[PDB]
């Protein structure tokens, strides 16, 4: 298989406006949302059809209760941080956990927290320690590292449980996650004069597009566009390079996607 990942995010807001929820948790397999929870619905719900059809209602009932507990814990932690920061107003607290099952068979695992969108605490499951960015985080680091058993639990979850969940969800949605739709690639001319290489209609979103001048690639001149969702489950991207009107050169677009290389000579 290709490389696949499972990630769970949490967002806590200290003083949200009337409609906005104070707590949100969403899970992803690769770029696909699989689950969602918020403090307004207070329910754990699937966001992918192959998740709903393969997990019994007991699964959603159990994690609805768990998320309600985790929602309250996240609020308590955010109250502690903003009090130690001596910050007024509304502030955000974020958590990210997940793992990757790489192509060769190896695995990675990660767990991080953020305050106001900036790194706050980062877990190292090999040294069993937390990296703190400031002294508010340093206080939390010392409290979390005093509980050696909790560090060992997080290591086991990242290396064993997370990977096990990923393989399970990978089987559930294999028709979606393990499929391949090759891109359609074209080259246009535009006076910004620059050569535009455009691809669309491909899945997975991972794709590499570069320009080459006379068989040599120089990434300084290449303008890289973002990989964007088209809305139908496929993606599109582009890359541009500016033409030299003072000398003749052979330009070519190179596109790699899912183990297939493509060259369009201009």
């Amino acid at each position, epitope marked *: 298989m290709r490389t696949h990942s499972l990630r769970y995010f949490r967002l806590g807001v200290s003083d949200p406006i009337h409609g906005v929820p104070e707590f949100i948790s969403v899970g992803y397999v690769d770029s696909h949302p699989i689950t969602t929870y918020d403090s307004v619905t207070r329910q754990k719900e699937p966001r992918a059809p192959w998740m709903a059809e393969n997990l019994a209602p007991d699964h959603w009932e159990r994690y609805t209760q768990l998320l309600r*507990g985790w929602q309250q814990m996240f609020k308590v932690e955010l109250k502690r941080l903003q009090r130690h920061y001596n910050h007024s107003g509304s502030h955000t607290y974020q958590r990210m956990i997940g793992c990757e099952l790489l192509e060769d068979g190896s695995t990675t695992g990660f767990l991080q927290y953020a305050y106001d969108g900036q790194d706050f605490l980062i877990f190292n499951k090999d040294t069993l320690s937390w990296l703190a960015v400031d002294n508010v985080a340093h206080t939390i680091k010392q409290a979390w590292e005093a509980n050696q*058993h909790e560090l060992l*639990y997080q290591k*086991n979850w990242l290396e064993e449980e997370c990977i096990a969940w990923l393989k399970r969800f990978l089987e559930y949605g294999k028709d979606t996650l393990q499929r391949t739709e090759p891109p359609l690639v074209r080259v246009n001319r535009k006076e910004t004069t620059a050569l535009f290489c455009k691809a669309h209609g491909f899945y997975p979103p991972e794709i590499y597009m570069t320009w080459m001048k006379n068989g040599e690639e120089i990434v300084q001149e290449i303008d890289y566009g973002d990989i964007l969702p088209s809305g139908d489950g496929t993606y599109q991207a582009w890359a541009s390079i500016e033409l030299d009107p003072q000398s003749s050169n052979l330009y070519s677009c190179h596109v790699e996607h899912s183990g297939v290389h493509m060259v369009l000579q201009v």
Partner: antibody, heavy 109, light 116 residues
Framework: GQNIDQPTEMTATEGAIVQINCTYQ??????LFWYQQHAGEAPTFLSY??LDGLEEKGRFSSFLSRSKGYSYLLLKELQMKDSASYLC??????????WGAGTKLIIKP | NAGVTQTPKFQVLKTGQSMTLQCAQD?????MYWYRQDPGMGLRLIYY???????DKGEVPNGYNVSRLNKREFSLRLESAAPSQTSVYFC??????????????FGEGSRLTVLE
């Protein structure tokens, strides 16, 4: 289904060493707890293991093997106060505790 | 520092009688549990409360009901007592639920005998 197994009863002599076994077959694994429960009293927390190896704690030590799915609680230098039931419990993938039936330890003076 | 306090320690009941077991914890814990213990098997969860304001069924909820009155109190209700409900009932609490290494703190237990 999910299953925990430990012996019903063990008898050892005061001052000796006793090893209480616990095997488990569960849906995922998030740790193994040992609890002590004297007759007519509340269970009290003894130890916890998630990774493989032996962890020591006074006269008691707890060992875990995740690949073999088994743990033991090791009591050294047995005293009469050690007479009790010892309960093993495992957290599954959904953080639900599955409890073993307990092992009654009888100490001969 | 009372820990987990549950009452009563003993109670005899007639079939069909109602009964409420009380449980309070002063450890500022968020998660609370109600177990029954029977000879020859492990503890079986009746109901639990992951946090203040929510409860859910356990493994053997039939014949029982609970109320998480506040953060401290978690009562267990037997509305129509049955002979099969003769057991020892333990209430427990932990700091949070879903955290891996968090252990349970048990109350002293309540022994119930239900007679025809």
């Amino acid at each position: 289904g999910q299953n925990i197994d430990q012996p019903t009863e063990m008898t050892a002599t005061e001052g000796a060493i006793v090893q209480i076994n616990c095997t488990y077959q569960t849906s995922g694994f998030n740790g193994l707890f040992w609890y002590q429960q004297h007759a007519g009293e509340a269970p009290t927390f003894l130890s916890y293991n998630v990774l493989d190896g032996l962890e020591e704690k006074g006269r008691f030590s707890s060992f875990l093997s995740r690949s073999k799915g088994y743990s033991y609680l090791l009591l050294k230098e047995l005293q009469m106060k050690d007479s009790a039931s010892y309960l093993c419990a495992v957290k599954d993938s959904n953080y639900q505790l599955i409890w073993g039936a307990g092992t009654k330890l009888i100490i001969k003076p | 520092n009372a820990g987990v306090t549950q009452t009563p320690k003993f109670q005899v009941l007639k079939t069909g009688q109602s009964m409420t077991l009380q449980c309070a914890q002063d450890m500022n814990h968020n998660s609370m549990y109600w177990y029954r213990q029977d000879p020859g098997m492990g503890l079986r969860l009746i109901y639990y409360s992951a946090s203040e304001g929510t409860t859910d069924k356990g493994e053997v909820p039939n014949g029982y009901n609970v109320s998480r009155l506040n953060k401290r109190e978690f009562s267990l209700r037997l509305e129509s007592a049955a002979p099969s409900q003769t057991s020892v009932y333990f209430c427990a609490s932990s700091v949070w639920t879903g955290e891996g290494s968090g252990e349970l703190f048990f109350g002293e237990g309540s022994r119930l005998t239900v007679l025809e």
